[PDB]
Symmetry: C2
Subunit: 158 residues, 2 copies
């Protein structure tokens, strides 16, 4: 009975920790790439102002980053609704921004870029928070697991 509970605990704690860790091996990547969307968005305005030849390539590059695996992989049952919903919004905002950029519309860009980037900012923040809650969970269960086993062994040994 004593050892059964020690193994059960070791398997549960280790299992949940690894399952959460496995769903977090790309949290940092996501935050980086989501983050970059902000720079790319302002770099587009900078291209539009300097008449850079690179405008169209950056347009498509932003689109590619937006729809990167890591970010598309956020549309899964276990990723909170807030993250998936913010992502979806970004995806809609981009269509307008891109269309505006194709029509050379700097005045609309100047007027909207702050809000536009603020939204990306919120998204990135949600990823940040999400990644922290999960890391916390790992902490709580790794802790409780080491404590539980220490307690089970303390009484059993006694």
């Amino acid at each position: 009975r004593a050892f059964f509970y020690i193994v059960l605990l070791s398997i549960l704690s280790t299992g949940i920790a690894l399952l959460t860790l496995a769903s977090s091996l790309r949290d940092a990547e996501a935050i980086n790439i989501a983050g970059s969307l902000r720079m790319q968005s302002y770099r587009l305005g900078y291209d539009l102002q300097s008449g850079s030849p690179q405008l169209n390539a950056h347009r498509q590059l932003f689109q590619q980053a937006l729809h990167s695996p890591v970010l598309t992989n956020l549309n899964v049952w276990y990723v909170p609704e807030a993250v998936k919903t913010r992502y979806a919004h970004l995806n809609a905002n981009w269509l307008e921004m891109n269309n505006r950029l194709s029509k050379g519309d700097l005045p609309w860009y100047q007027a909207n870029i702050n809000n536009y980037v603020n939204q990306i900012d919120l998204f990135v923040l949600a990823l940040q928070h999400y990644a922290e809650r999960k890391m916390l969970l790992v902490v709580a269960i790794s802790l409780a697991g080491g404590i539980g086993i220490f307690t089970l062994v303390f009484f059993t040994l006694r």
Copy 2:
């Protein structure tokens, strides 16, 4: 002897995991804020091109983000040399960029911004990688801990 090894293992595994996790509760924040430096850098060029009144505020805002606690806290013995060294570079590059921005020097900006942002990019990538190695470690020890205890209990029970 059997239970002594089961507790020792539970304490080691849990200890190292928590110690690594504790040194990673702000990995996501770091990547976000380091990431933002990229956007802020291009937003500065955009201000400089549009003659925005916000130029000076963004200059100082970038400086404040650059020197944020989370990022200054990277200068510690247990953070790899590569991260601390890239950070230091950013800190030097900013002084030139800021001085150039004060003298209204768009031509130098246009010519250097890509390289300048590429460096921030590398920094952010190093933070990303660093955060992943640590998360891996947590995975490896949480795993080995649950396995070790399962094995210790299997033989002891047998």
